[PDB]
Amino acid sequence: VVARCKLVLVGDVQCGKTAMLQVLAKDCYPETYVPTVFENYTACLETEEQRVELSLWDTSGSPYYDNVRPLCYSDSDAVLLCFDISRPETVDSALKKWRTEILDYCPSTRVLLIGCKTDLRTDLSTLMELSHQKQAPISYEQGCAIAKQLGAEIYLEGSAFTSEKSIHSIFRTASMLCL
């Protein structure tokens, strides 16, 4: 049985949503930022004991689209709440805003927390730039703690830029959780 699964990604502008989808579905990384309006992707993968067909909905992180974004939440198997690990702020109150929008659509919808750009954890520009904000990249441990406080089923993370296998792994796990 080829199982079918609808996943929606949401999160702040530039947090890494499209980069993940392009890697997963097109084996393509976009080094230059092009803001998303809306896009759909299709990916097939094997998830443990199943072939799964993923229907993936890419949304804009911009508040300009707040009135129209919830329309893609219908009949979703999970919403992937994404954040940039290098920006303890796409996390901060913003993941609360994001979590509430998903709750306000339907409290029954499953939420997975996805950390993006994990390669920036050891990047020296990121480290210093954040240090004089008295901050540091989000660690794996912090990701898990955030997932708990946002009622996400799991924290998963990757790097679209340096590890395509980290991305395929996120979506394999996401699919098993929805099956």
Ligand X SMILES: Nc1nc2c(ncn2[C@@H]2O[C@H](COP(=O)(O)OP(=O)(O)OP(=O)(O)O)[C@@H](O)[C@H]2O)c(=O)[nH]1
Cβ–Cβ under 8 Å, residues 75 and 6: yes
| Residue closer to ligand X, measured from CB, 4 or 33 | 33
Q: What part of residues 46-105 is at the interface with ligand X (CB under 6 A)? A: 60-61
Q: Is 126 annotated as a binding residue?
A: no
Site mask for Mg ion (CB under 5 A), range 136-175, x = bound:
----------------------------------------
How does DSSP classify residue 16? S
Residue 114 interacts with, from Mg ion, ligand X, none (CB under 5-8 Å by kind): none
Site mask for ligand X (CB under 6 A), range 137-156, x = bound:
--------------------
Residue 82, strand partner residues: 114
What is the spatial distance between Cα 96 and Cα 102, in angstroms, rounded to a whole number?
10
The single residue among 36, 139, 169, 173 that binds Mg ion, judged by CB under 5 A, is: 36
| Residue closer to Mg ion, measured from CB, 36 or 163 | 36
Instruction: Tell me the three state secondary structure of residue 113.
Output: strand
Assess 160 for contact with ligand X (CB under 6 A). yes
Residue 84, strand partner residues: 116
Cβ–Cβ under 8 Å, residues 147 and 46: no
What distance, in Å, lies between the first and last C-alpha atoms of the chain? 12
Single out the residue of 172, 9, 159, 5 nearest to residue 82, CA to CA. Answer: 9
Q: Is 106 annotated as a binding residue?
A: no
The residues of the shown chain that bind Mg ion, judged by CB under 5 A, are: 17-18, 36
The residues of the shown chain that bind ligand X, judged by CB under 6 A, are: 13-19, 30-33, 35-36, 60-61, 116-117, 119-120, 159-161
